[PDB]
Scaffold this active site. Structure first.
Site, mmCIF file in Angstrom:
data_model
loop_
_atom_site.group_PDB
_atom_site.id
_atom_site.type_symbol
_atom_site.label_atom_id
_atom_site.label_comp_id
_atom_site.label_asym_id
_atom_site.label_seq_id
_atom_site.Cartn_x
_atom_site.Cartn_y
_atom_site.Cartn_z
ATOM 1 N N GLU A 65 0.747 -1.265 0.000
ATOM 2 C CA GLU A 65 0.000 0.000 0.000
ATOM 3 C C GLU A 65 0.778 1.317 0.000
ATOM 4 O O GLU A 65 0.500 2.204 0.814
ATOM 5 C CB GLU A 65 -0.959 -0.012 1.194
ATOM 6 C CG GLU A 65 -1.470 -1.410 1.521
ATOM 7 C CD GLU A 65 -2.505 -1.437 2.630
ATOM 8 O OE1 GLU A 65 -2.480 -0.556 3.508
ATOM 9 O OE2 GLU A 65 -3.336 -2.362 2.635
ATOM 10 N N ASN B 175 2.283 -5.124 -3.416
ATOM 11 C CA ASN B 175 0.892 -5.416 -3.093
ATOM 12 C C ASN B 175 0.100 -4.157 -2.739
ATOM 13 O O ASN B 175 0.615 -3.282 -2.049
ATOM 14 C CB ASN B 175 0.872 -6.408 -1.924
ATOM 15 C CG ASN B 175 -0.485 -7.038 -1.700
ATOM 16 O OD1 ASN B 175 -1.047 -7.680 -2.593
ATOM 17 N ND2 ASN B 175 -1.013 -6.875 -0.494
ATOM 18 N N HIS C 270 -10.066 -6.292 -2.596
ATOM 19 C CA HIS C 270 -11.041 -6.180 -1.517
ATOM 20 C C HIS C 270 -12.190 -5.422 -2.167
ATOM 21 O O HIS C 270 -12.193 -4.194 -2.227
ATOM 22 C CB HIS C 270 -10.459 -5.400 -0.334
ATOM 23 C CG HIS C 270 -9.496 -6.195 0.493
ATOM 24 N ND1 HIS C 270 -9.857 -7.353 1.148
ATOM 25 C CD2 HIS C 270 -8.187 -5.992 0.786
ATOM 26 C CE1 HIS C 270 -8.815 -7.829 1.809
ATOM 27 N NE2 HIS C 270 -7.789 -7.022 1.606
ATOM 28 N N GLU D 245 -5.754 -10.928 -1.712
ATOM 29 C CA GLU D 245 -6.573 -10.838 -0.507
ATOM 30 C C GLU D 245 -8.052 -10.759 -0.847
ATOM 31 O O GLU D 245 -8.797 -9.984 -0.265
ATOM 32 C CB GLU D 245 -6.145 -9.602 0.293
ATOM 33 C CG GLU D 245 -4.663 -9.605 0.665
ATOM 34 C CD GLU D 245 -4.238 -8.360 1.423
ATOM 35 O OE1 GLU D 245 -5.111 -7.728 2.053
ATOM 36 O OE2 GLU D 245 -3.034 -8.022 1.405
ATOM 37 N N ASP E 112 -11.939 -10.942 -1.265
ATOM 38 C CA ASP E 112 -13.165 -11.011 -0.480
ATOM 39 C C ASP E 112 -14.125 -10.010 -1.108
ATOM 40 O O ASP E 112 -13.734 -8.907 -1.498
ATOM 41 C CB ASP E 112 -12.972 -10.771 1.041
ATOM 42 C CG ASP E 112 -12.223 -9.496 1.383
ATOM 43 O OD1 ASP E 112 -12.324 -8.484 0.659
ATOM 44 O OD2 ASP E 112 -11.542 -9.514 2.430
ATOM 45 N N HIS F 265 -44.742 -25.560 -17.623
ATOM 46 C CA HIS F 265 -45.512 -24.603 -18.405
ATOM 47 C C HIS F 265 -45.120 -23.185 -18.018
ATOM 48 O O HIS F 265 -44.635 -22.945 -16.913
ATOM 49 C CB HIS F 265 -47.024 -24.809 -18.219
ATOM 50 C CG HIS F 265 -47.487 -24.757 -16.797
ATOM 51 N ND1 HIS F 265 -47.286 -25.790 -15.907
ATOM 52 C CD2 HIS F 265 -48.171 -23.804 -16.118
ATOM 53 C CE1 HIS F 265 -47.829 -25.479 -14.744
ATOM 54 N NE2 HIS F 265 -48.372 -24.279 -14.844
ATOM 55 N N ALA G 95 -37.036 -35.484 -4.668
ATOM 56 C CA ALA G 95 -38.423 -35.776 -5.008
ATOM 57 C C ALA G 95 -38.792 -36.944 -4.104
ATOM 58 O O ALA G 95 -38.281 -38.051 -4.275
ATOM 59 C CB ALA G 95 -38.539 -36.177 -6.475
ATOM 60 N N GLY H 67 -38.832 -40.858 -4.577
ATOM 61 C CA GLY H 67 -38.473 -41.001 -5.974
ATOM 62 C C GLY H 67 -39.677 -40.903 -6.890
ATOM 63 O O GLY H 67 -39.648 -41.395 -8.016
ATOM 64 N N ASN I 210 -33.824 -38.432 -9.015
ATOM 65 C CA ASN I 210 -34.834 -37.701 -8.256
ATOM 66 C C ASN I 210 -34.169 -36.592 -7.446
ATOM 67 O O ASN I 210 -34.771 -36.030 -6.529
ATOM 68 C CB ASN I 210 -35.585 -38.649 -7.317
ATOM 69 C CG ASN I 210 -34.711 -39.172 -6.195
ATOM 70 O OD1 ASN I 210 -33.592 -39.633 -6.426
ATOM 71 N ND2 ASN I 210 -35.220 -39.110 -4.970
#
Ligand SMILES: CO[C@H]1[C@H](O)[C@@H](O)[C@@H](O[C@H]2[C@H](O[C@@H]3CO[C@@H](O[C@@H]4CO[C@@H](O)[C@H](O)[C@H]4O)[C@H](O)[C@H]3O)OC[C@@H](O)[C@@H]2O)O[C@@H]1C(=O)O
Ligand SMILES: CO[C@H]1[C@H](O)[C@@H](O)[C@@H](O[C@H]2[C@H](O[C@@H]3CO[C@@H](O[C@@H]4CO[C@@H](O)[C@H](O)[C@H]4O)[C@H](O)[C@H]3O)OC[C@@H](O)[C@@H]2O)O[C@@H]1C(=O)O
Ligand SMILES: CO[C@H]1[C@H](O)[C@@H](O)[C@@H](O[C@H]2[C@H](O[C@@H]3CO[C@@H](O[C@@H]4CO[C@@H](O)[C@H](O)[C@H]4O)[C@H](O)[C@H]3O)OC[C@@H](O)[C@@H]2O)O[C@@H]1C(=O)O
Ligand SMILES: O[C@@H]1[C@@H](O)[C@H](O[C@@H]2CO[C@@H](O[C@@H]3CO[C@@H](O)[C@H](O)[C@H]3O)[C@H](O)[C@H]2O)OC[C@H]1O
Ligand SMILES: O[C@@H]1[C@@H](O)[C@H](O[C@@H]2CO[C@@H](O)[C@H](O)[C@H]2O)OC[C@H]1O
Ligand SMILES: O[C@@H]1[C@@H](O)[C@H](O[C@@H]2CO[C@@H](O)[C@H](O)[C@H]2O)OC[C@H]1O
Ligand code: XYP
Ligand code: XYP
Lengths: 436, 436
Positions: A128, A170, A207, A236, A238, A343, A409, A412, A430
């Site tokens: 940084e 970085n 980030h 890093e 996230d 449908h 389901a 089955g 199923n």
């Protein structure tokens, strides 16, 4: 392999890692996930300045080694984080400036790299160094005030201390190419390569949040840096909200640039995150895989060749041909869903949100009121609960995040009116579904 | 009076209360909300059997009176909870049986009600006496084994102890009219009224979640019991996920029933909840009003001038006469919204979800980057953070849950292209909107 992030990433010659906190290594749920899913490890705080050199000239590697030892013991490589930085400096360093600070910086780099010499895959040598004011200039810190050449000096020092490690620069907010910060770091790395300043990689913290959102141009950013002759890595990662689509987009951008070495997410579980409030990681508090996890894994495995049903779309069971249907198009909370002839009717139109929900009517969510086998799957008002989030596995199954159980389901069955439930996943027809 | 829940409820002769925990009365963040919003109080645990009679014949009203006094001193009436129940009985009562237990029950009632005689508005004389087994019969407990007539005895004793208090039968899962438990209680109260058993009210705990979802027939239930000649009260309301629609629906159900005395939510902030994990209350842990809070207040005050848009609609600024618009129908996270001539396009169709989000395109959410004035309002993937939740005030303003700030057309602009920001609510025309 293609069942874990690390192994999946390995299929494209890349790695997938996380950030390990030594204080959490005694938590079995934590280590079970971390050891299984990642093949690269970054110490979340243990190798930082204050942690490795508590008092000037007095180095301490106990905390760092706990992380390191665990990593190699579990077949993971390690990213060293971080050698020169304005933040988290021990008190003795914070009160330094000028030449005294410059030499302390050099002494610190030599001390830490020497201890880990030949053991670290990548080192975030400088972290940084650029400002966020929007000018793309240098961050105004005690380090920068010692002279503009401090970064260059840090890299030259690092190369000499351990020539086997990849030296990375970085930073965050350098993912969107249109941001001035991004271009400033670019110009520096370019200057470095032109003059012979030792630098092998650029780390993109990544980030992402609504303040600094992900942008598709991140791929051009990666391409641009790659073109300078340096490797790039997502260090890093996230994402605020943990969007399935955003997580997949980032993954694909990296796999799109041959020089992108791999991806590291900043933490294991959301509860372990430095920003748990943003629930930004791939695993939730109780250790279960989130919808984004599945999306990341699927992207790593190449994904599919059938564009995801953007907005709306029916869900048909391959073992019955019937579509996931809500009895008589009811909007009554607690209505157990069923199988019915397909449908064009909203009560059969499901939207898979980036948050992992399967929505109907636009505000009703597929919901499970229980975690055991036989739990009735129903619709309920959407509120974001884990029992309302699902993972769409590539094997055709739909697993409940909270339960870890598959949509089943009942008995089955295959005839209209067949009720849906949760049950231990079985490759049975199923339990397989097809988007449309 | 209509800026606070209690005062709004009082407009229709009703009350809006909460459950108070004596241990939190020392927390100013807790009491600031509690003393301001409610005019009815229920001791969460301080007036229960084990708490009031630790040893048979030895009553302890210290904790109970603590809550009682706080209530009265702050202008709130009190619901006594609870005199006869199978749960939370002191150790000595849990072992009693037959007649000895029957006499212990009678004594307990006389003791507690004697101490509070004439001071309590309502008493949950008997709590949860019915089973959830689907039979509609009595729950099997030491009390029920003393004889099926125990409930009747409890009420007759209660009437004698304090003829001034309204005597209620309190239970959960008796809200849905189609449930056996519900009819089981309905039949008992009807019988009581026919035989002259002293009972004045029925308390509906109203604990709603995917396991036992809210159903519109809840109103039918309230009206049916009401017709029997007893008052009805919502005693422990909390909704899993705190849906705005459900909270508003319950409030309107009580307002629709002349005999519905009022509504009590089981707690103050989500963090004070016995089910905090379901964030089922009206205030966040930080004390901020949730989307549901405004829905309740609006309902209590009457509601909107016109039937609110049921998902999908324009939001037009009063001062500008222009609509909330996403520039060029962009779907890029981080795109700041603006005002623009209203027209039928998806980039102007906003859906207010039960969770308080303002959705566009289906999976995009009105989003605020920060919390201060000038914060940009934009679109971002939906994840449910508080910076993506909004309260629709009856004055036309829209407030961000997290920031507590209003949607504001920058510089009071009215022209196309005017950007939207967060700003201290001012009742200005550039902060007023109409759902059209
Ligand atoms: C003292 O109150 C707070 C601090 O304000 C807060 O920073 C935090 O401090 C912890 C420390 O947290 C670390 C901070 O660094 C994170 O990783 C960085 C994220 O930003 C990137 O740009 C950097 O490159 C990353 O290195 C890391 O995830 C957090 O865990 O950890 C050590 C603690 O001793 C220190 O107090 O938390 C405290 C607090 O909650 O008390
Ligand atoms: C494992 O111990 C747990 C208990 O299992 C858990 O119940 C809780 O117990 C506390 C107790 O909590 C009270 C319980 O009653 C709640 O209110 C009732 C909710 O159900 C309705 O049907 C009733 O009518 C309501 O009265 C109330 O909100 C909770 O606060 O409070 C007294 C404590 O001594 C007891 O331990 O927590 C314990 C635990 O965490 O140790
Ligand atoms: C087929 O007709 C379409 C038009 O092709 C389509 O553009 C749209 O036109 C609407 C008009 O849409 C506005 C246009 O402005 C957008 O915001 C711009 C953001 O970038 C700035 O630089 C510009 O100055 C801004 O104008 C705004 O987001 C859109 O909603 O709105 C007025 C309508 O009368 C016009 O038809 O939609 C039509 C259509 O579908 O009818
Ligand atoms: O207590 C309330 C005051 O805090 C409130 O202050 C108003 C805040 O908005 C001001 O106008 C804004 C100026 O900045 C622009 O960007 C915005 O678009 C404008 O809305 C207004 O001048 C202040 O008075 O006023 C109401 C009080 O109750
Ligand atoms: O510590 C660093 C934070 O201060 C930094 O904050 C960023 C500020 O600009 C915003 O646009 C970003 O969203 C926000 O994250 O983030 C990185 C962190 O390491
Ligand atoms: O103590 C009571 C709980 O036992 C009760 O539990 C309910 C059982 O039925 C389920 O369908 C509901 O979801 C669940 O809450 O809830 C009320 C509480 O007071
Ligand atoms: O839900 C089903 C509906 O979609 C179909 O049209 O008619 C039968 C219903 O059960
Ligand atoms: O449908 C379920 C089936 O998939 C499972 O294998 O066995 C139990 C059944 O109810």
């Amino acid at each position: 392999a293609e069942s874990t992030l690390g192994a999946a990433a390995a299929q494209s010659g890349r790695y997938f890692g996380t950030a390990i906190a030594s204080g959490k290594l005694g938590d079995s749920a934590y280590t079970t996930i971390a050891s299984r899913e990642f093949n690269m490890v970054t110490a979340e705080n243990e190798m930082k300045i204050d942690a490795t050199e508590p008092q000037r000239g007095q180095f301490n590697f106990s905390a760092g080694d706990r992380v390191y030892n665990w990593a190699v013991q579990n077949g993971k490589q390690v990213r060293g984080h971080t050698l020169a930085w304005h933040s988290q400096q021990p008190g003795w360093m914070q009160s330094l400036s000028g030449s005294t600070l410059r030499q302390a910086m050099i002494d610190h780099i030599n001390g830490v790299m020497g201890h880990y010499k030949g053991k670290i895959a990548q080192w975030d040598v400088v972290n940084e160094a650029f400002s966020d004011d929007g000018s793309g200039g240098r961050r105004d810190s005690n380090l920068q005030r010692t002279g503009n050449d401090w970064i260059e000096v840090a890299f030259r020092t690092a190369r000499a201390a351990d020539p086997a490690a990849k030296l990375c620069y970085n930073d965050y907010n350098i993912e969107n190419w249109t941001w001035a910060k991004t271009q400033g770091v670019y110009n520096m790395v370019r200057d470095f390569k032109q003059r012979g300043v030792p630098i092998d990689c650029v780390g993109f913290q990544s980030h992402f949040n609504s303040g600094s959102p992900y942008n598709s141009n991140f791929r051009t950013t990666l391409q641009n840096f790659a073109a300078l002759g340096v490797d790039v890595a997502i260090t890093e990662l996230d994402i605020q909200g943990a969007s399935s689509s955003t997580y997949a987009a980032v993954t694909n951008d990296c796999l799109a640039v041959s020089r992108c070495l791999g991806i590291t997410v900043w933490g294991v579980r959301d509860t372990d995150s430095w920003r748990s409030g943003d629930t930004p990681l791939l695993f939730n508090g109780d250790g279960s895989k989130k919808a984004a996890y599945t999306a990341v894994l699927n992207a790593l495995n190449g994904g599919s060749s059938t564009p995801p049903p953007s907005g709306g779309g029916q869900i048909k069971g391959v073992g019955s041909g019937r579509c996931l249907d809500v009895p008589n198009a009811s909007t009554t909370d607690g209505t157990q869903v069923q199988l019915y002839d397909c449908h064009s009717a909203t009560n059969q139109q499901w939207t898979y949100t980036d948050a992992g929900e399967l929505r109907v009517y636009g505000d009703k969510c597929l919901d499970a009121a229980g975690t055991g086998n036989g739990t009735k799957v129903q619709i309920y008002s959407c509120w974001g609960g884990d029992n309302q989030k699902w993972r769409l596995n590539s094997d055709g199954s739909i697993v409940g995040v909270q339960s870890g159980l598959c949509l089943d389901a009942v008995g089955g069955g295959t005839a209209n009116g067949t009720l849906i439930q949760l049950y231990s996943c079985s490759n049975g027809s199923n339990q397989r579904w097809t988007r449309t």
